[PDB]
Amino acid sequence: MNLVLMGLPGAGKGTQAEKIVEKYGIPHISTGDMFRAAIKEGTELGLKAKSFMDKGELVPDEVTIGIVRERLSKDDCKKGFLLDGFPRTVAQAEALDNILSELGKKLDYVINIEVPKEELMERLTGRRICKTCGATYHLIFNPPKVEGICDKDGGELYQRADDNPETVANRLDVNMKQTQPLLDFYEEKGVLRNIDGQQDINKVFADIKALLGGL
Ligand SMILES: Nc1ncnc2c1ncn2[C@@H]1O[C@H](COP(=O)(O)OP(=O)(O)O)[C@@H](O)[C@H]1O
Ligand SMILES: Nc1ncnc2c1ncn2[C@@H]1O[C@H](COP(=O)(O)O)[C@@H](O)[C@H]1O
Numbered sequence: 646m647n648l649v650l651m652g653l654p655g656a657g658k659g660t661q662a663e664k665i666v667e668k669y670g671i672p673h674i675s676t677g678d679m680f681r682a683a684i685k686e687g688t689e690l691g692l693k694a695k696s697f698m699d700k701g702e703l704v705p706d707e708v709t710i711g712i713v714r715e716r717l718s719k720d721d722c723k724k725g726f727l728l729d730g731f732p733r734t735v736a737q738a739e740a741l742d743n744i745l746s747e748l749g750k751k752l753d754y755v756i757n758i759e760v761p762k763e764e765l766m767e768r769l770t771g772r773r774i775c776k777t778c779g780a781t782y783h784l785i786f787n788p789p790k791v792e793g794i795c796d797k798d799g800g801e802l803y804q805r806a807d808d809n810p811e812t813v814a815n816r817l818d819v820n821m822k823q824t825q826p827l828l829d830f831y832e833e834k835g836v837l838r839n840i841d842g843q844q845d846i847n848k849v850f851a852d853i854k855a856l857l858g859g860l
């Protein structure tokens with residue numbers, strides 16, 4: 646089961662990714678998670694990635710492709726994987742095509758979770774994520790069992806530096822700019838499925854399960 650989740654910041658990819666991996670047991674590969682881990686570790690790569698991430702800009706394709714290639718070479722990806730938030734440029738989708746040629750694999754689906762722009766600000770400003778595993782919550786729409794504490798592992802919940810209204814507006818511009826070229830790319834391959842992300846979390850998941858049951 647070889648999957649991409651795509652969608653604008655705040656659309657629900659992490660949320661759904663968590664549910665997909667619990668149900669099916671494939672690895673969650675999130676480029677955002679990896680970069681935040683790198684910045685927390687203080688790696689050379691993390692410190693270089695921080696400047697883009699703090700501005701809501703994309704990390705260069707070379708760096709991003711490098712981290713994803715390495716992740717995809719691990720044994721846990723041999724029975725499938727979930728890419729969450731990669732690719733985000735047509736160059737990255739082209740790279741992924743080649744990578745997957747080398748791995749003798751193809752994407753089963755690119756799941757595009759569509760949410761109107763106007764709703765994304767509220768999703769992002771109420772978002773809180775776990776320090777220790779990156780689980781995603783929302784203070785209104787999806788709160789933790791206990792305020793400020795992750796359901797899974799008890800980690801502290803925090804507001805991402807980039808989930809402030811100024812940085813969010815730049816993020817939405819930057820990612821929208823890449824969206825139609827990516828939709829067109831995967832529409833041409835015939836693997837793009839659009840999901841209505843303006844539904845109940847569990848309804849959105851129901852729709853994804855309908856796609857995935859076959860693989
Ligand atoms: N279908 C939904 N309805 C309402 N809120 C949602 C839904 N899906 C996710 N959320 C919440 O909105 C925010 C963005 O979701 P998230 O999965 O982190 O987005 P992404 O990974 O696409 O940026 C989070 O605070 C999350 O709890
Ligand atoms: N595929 C990617 N390409 C370039 N930058 C990325 C990618 N995925 C994540 N990032 C960087 O990580 C930040 C957080 O991503 P996310 O966690 O998906 O919101 C983005 O604003 C980018 O700076």
Ligand SMILES: [Zn+2]
Binds near residue numbers: 777795
């Ligand atoms: Zn956690």
